[PDB]
Amino acid sequence: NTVEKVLKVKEEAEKRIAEIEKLENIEEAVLKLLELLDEVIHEAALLPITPETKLIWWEIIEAIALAALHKLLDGGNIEVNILLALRILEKAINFLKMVGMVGEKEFEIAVKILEAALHVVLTLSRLLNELEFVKVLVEFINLIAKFFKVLKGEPEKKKRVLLKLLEDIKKVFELWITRVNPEQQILFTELVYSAIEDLKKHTLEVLG
Amino acid sequence: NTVEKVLKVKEEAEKRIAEIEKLENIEEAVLKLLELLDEVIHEAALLPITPETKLIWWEIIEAIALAALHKLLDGGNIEVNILLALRILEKAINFLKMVGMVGEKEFEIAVKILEAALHVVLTLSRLLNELEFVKVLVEFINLIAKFFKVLKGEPEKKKRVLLKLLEDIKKVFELWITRVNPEQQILFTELVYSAIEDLKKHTLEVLG
Amino acid sequence: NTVEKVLKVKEEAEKRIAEIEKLENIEEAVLKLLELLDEVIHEAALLPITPETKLIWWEIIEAIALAALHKLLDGGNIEVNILLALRILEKAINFLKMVGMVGEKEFEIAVKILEAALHVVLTLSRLLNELEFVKVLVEFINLIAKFFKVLKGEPEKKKRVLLKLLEDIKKVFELWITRVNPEQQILFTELVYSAIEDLKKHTLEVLG
Amino acid sequence: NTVEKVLKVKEEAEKRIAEIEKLENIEEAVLKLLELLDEVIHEAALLPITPETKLIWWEIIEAIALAALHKLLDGGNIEVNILLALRILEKAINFLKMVGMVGEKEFEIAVKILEAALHVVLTLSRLLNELEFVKVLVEFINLIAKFFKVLKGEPEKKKRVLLKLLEDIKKVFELWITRVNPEQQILFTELVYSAIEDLKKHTLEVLG
Amino acid sequence: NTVEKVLKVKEEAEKRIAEIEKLENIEEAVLKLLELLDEVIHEAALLPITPETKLIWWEIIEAIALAALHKLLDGGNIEVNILLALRILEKAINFLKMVGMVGEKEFEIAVKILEAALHVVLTLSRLLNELEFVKVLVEFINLIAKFFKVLKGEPEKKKRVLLKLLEDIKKVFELWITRVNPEQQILFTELVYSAIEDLKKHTLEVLG
Ligand SMILES: [Zn+2]
Ligand SMILES: [Zn+2]
Ligand SMILES: [Zn+2]
Ligand SMILES: [Zn+2]
Ligand SMILES: [Zn+2]
Ligand SMILES: [Zn+2]
Ligand SMILES: [Zn+2]
Ligand SMILES: [Zn+2]
Ligand SMILES: [Zn+2]
Ligand SMILES: [Zn+2]
């Protein structure tokens, strides 16, 4: 049966997650987690999707992704780690496209993954240069736009989630901007606020 | 009749624009929009131009170009996006050459395209390095000189448009220069101001 | 009986695979595996195909091909190894042609062989020059088009497999393109995206 | 017998240490000490480890490491010296991995090396910029996590050592933070306290 | 007697080594040393091997190989020198094959030759381009796999030697990777780490 295959995949994935967790070397652990995500998504693509297996696939993806993000917080190069976080998010979005329609549980899981990735990215970007920080900010805003355009749901819930993410981003940016001299302050504030407003317009038209 | 052909081209172009707008991947969307612009210009070159069809052709070009520029604001690599904006402007200038004489409506449309490209370029160049920023500035000033050399119109209107563009450039540059140490400040100020003065001279002699 | 002959061939092939695995020199090992594959295909052509023997033939082909691909990862010249991987894929496609109609198990085996070849090719192509890398990419996209044109199955499964392969290719290409200067970036991006869209068109029309 | 070989190695290492101490140029001395450490570790890996030779190997490694760290305090480029301290610590951790089980004396020696490296790193990082200082802090916290993950011992002793190291780090950080403006203060305090809490969690789970 | 012949070979080999050492031109000296190695191996193949003569043959091979490697460090073309180091290693491996069973002294000599070749290769590859450096790394990892597959010994000693070699390679690679932009960083890290994991799997299966 298909469900039996999915739970076998889940068991093997948890075993591999424990094995990687016992690897004592963070740089070679995140790559193994990414390869595990790739294998899981390949297996998911092999078999046809059904409502009962969607939740199990989402739990597998959520476990692997959260483990990988926390490992990204545990040492390495900052820019490489930010790139890896964005790539994990992109793989999640591709799986979202493949799985099609989602329910409330899948919506919650996807929002959890997005929120964890956002927190990791903000924590890591606190240590970048000015141009790199603002570039990472703009890139993540565009990624949020893509994620909300692919993911479907009731407009009110998506609006609330978007507001929460924007408040997180704004808090970090308003703390960070005080170090960049009053003219670069104006430049970066205009750029970031325009990006946020364009994001709001895009997702609000998506809601309609 | 030529007019029905041009309106059919317009209908097809709007249909393709909607299709591209629903493509969820920005990097593949700008390239498709540029390809659509190329096909539209090839069709325009195929049939001979008349006063009635000029306006319709300009609306098609305006729609495609504005969509492409806004998509350029929506994610990608900064330098590639700036190059693509300059490419869209150059295609518009080549179409202006092909058309020949331009009236008031066509002048207004072309000025709008130029202003949109300038705003996109400034917004994106805010995130570049020093040398790359100044190189982009000089390149866009030269592009403005070429655009005003090709385009014909009343000297006072062109003077007002040129002054507005120069004020935009000067505002962005005067905000940006405060971050580059007082000697590089003198170097870049000399270079940029000389470029602007040469642009003024060239366009004022173009007025004739 | 025919089935007895097929299992005799299978046993001989496994014995030869073990012998080659104990050969300690990779360049001679891949060629010996290719010769074994040729012998197996000749034997398959000699006997008439039946539904029960199709699975056994596919298992033999799968074992030999996966062993040869993993050996291709284990040392040699990069370009020769890429060519050998493509040759193994082409031999599998020719066997697919000779066999004809396939079930779900044969579909899974063929997709697994294709994915193993794709991963080997991407890994080996990371070390090529710009032009060679893009040439290998385009050649493999055309090979994927041929493979999907020859292989028959339900449109949804083929669409999912194609999407997964395209995501893999886009992953590697988007990591690689950041080293080739913002103008070659535009050139290669246009070329590769046009190739991918043409592949999508061909495959989707094949599905219908 | 292995033992007399190990004391030969010890005699040669001490002779080379004296020779390097008489070299009057600090940049060439740290590199020579690192080469000597590499040679000693190669010799150690050559022969199989025994309980009696473990102590002698640890005394040799402790002598070389302490000499190299003190030489790192005696002049050079700050960032290169911090990097070299981290690499000495990483070599000690790799030797910990190779040896395996560690007794009380080896535990004391390893903690001595770790504490010396920490004090050197804090002293040198006192002269860095804000971003570089906080990056070095986070890197060393992750290195402490790796060191405690590899090294085994009674939970209470490891807890006490961890508390001592954290008090050292916190004292230096609380002195340093008063110079970075009240908003960057909040940013860096959040980041550093989160890193310390993660370190505590990881180590305490390792103890269990 | 055979032993007398072997010591005659040794005496003339040392005489030739001194003559070559007095040659003042390194390019002609490495080729002469390689020719001397070829002559020695031909002589060794001429007479049948015995337990007593194996050690003497290994001392001759070790002397010639170490002299040739150090000369490779003393000037020439970087790529040609790396190739020549690999050829010296391959000749040593072929001699290992022809000799057969290996004791502890021969194991020690072979490991020393391998380590000398590895250090020469790392030192010379420090000055290559990105693609050439990674290609040399992958080639040497495959050569290490071949060497450990041909050479026989107790699993623990081979495991320790392999771990030391991997730490050497990782040290050089982690110093080098910081210059290649964060996306090529991910690409090369995935490639190299996968190669190292495959090497570990291969030799650990060989140990069993
Ligand atoms: Zn952690
Ligand atoms: Zn939040
Ligand atoms: Zn937008
Ligand atoms: Zn304006
Ligand atoms: Zn292998
Ligand atoms: Zn894949
Ligand atoms: Zn001192
Ligand atoms: Zn202390
Ligand atoms: Zn020399
Ligand atoms: Zn070494």
PDB file of C-alpha atoms and ligand atoms in Angstrom, chain C residues 26 70-71 73-75, chain E residues 142 198-199 201-202, ligand 5:
ATOM      1  CA  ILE C  26      38.435   1.989 -12.818  1.00  0.00           C
ATOM      2  CA  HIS C  70      28.854   4.811  -9.753  1.00  0.00           C
ATOM      3  CA  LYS C  71      32.151   3.664 -11.258  1.00  0.00           C
ATOM      4  CA  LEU C  73      31.996   8.783 -10.398  1.00  0.00           C
ATOM      5  CA  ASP C  74      35.152   6.970  -9.179  1.00  0.00           C
ATOM      6  CA  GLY C  75      37.901   8.585 -11.253  1.00  0.00           C
TER       7      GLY C  75
ATOM      8  CA  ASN E 142      40.652   8.673  -6.071  1.00  0.00           C
ATOM      9  CA  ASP E 198      32.612   7.847  -0.986  1.00  0.00           C
ATOM     10  CA  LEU E 199      36.290   7.302  -0.158  1.00  0.00           C
ATOM     11  CA  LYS E 201      32.755   4.039   2.372  1.00  0.00           C
ATOM     12  CA  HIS E 202      35.076   2.313  -0.109  1.00  0.00           C
TER      13      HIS E 202
HETATM   14 ZN    ZN F   5      32.976   5.260  -5.545  1.00  0.00          ZN
END
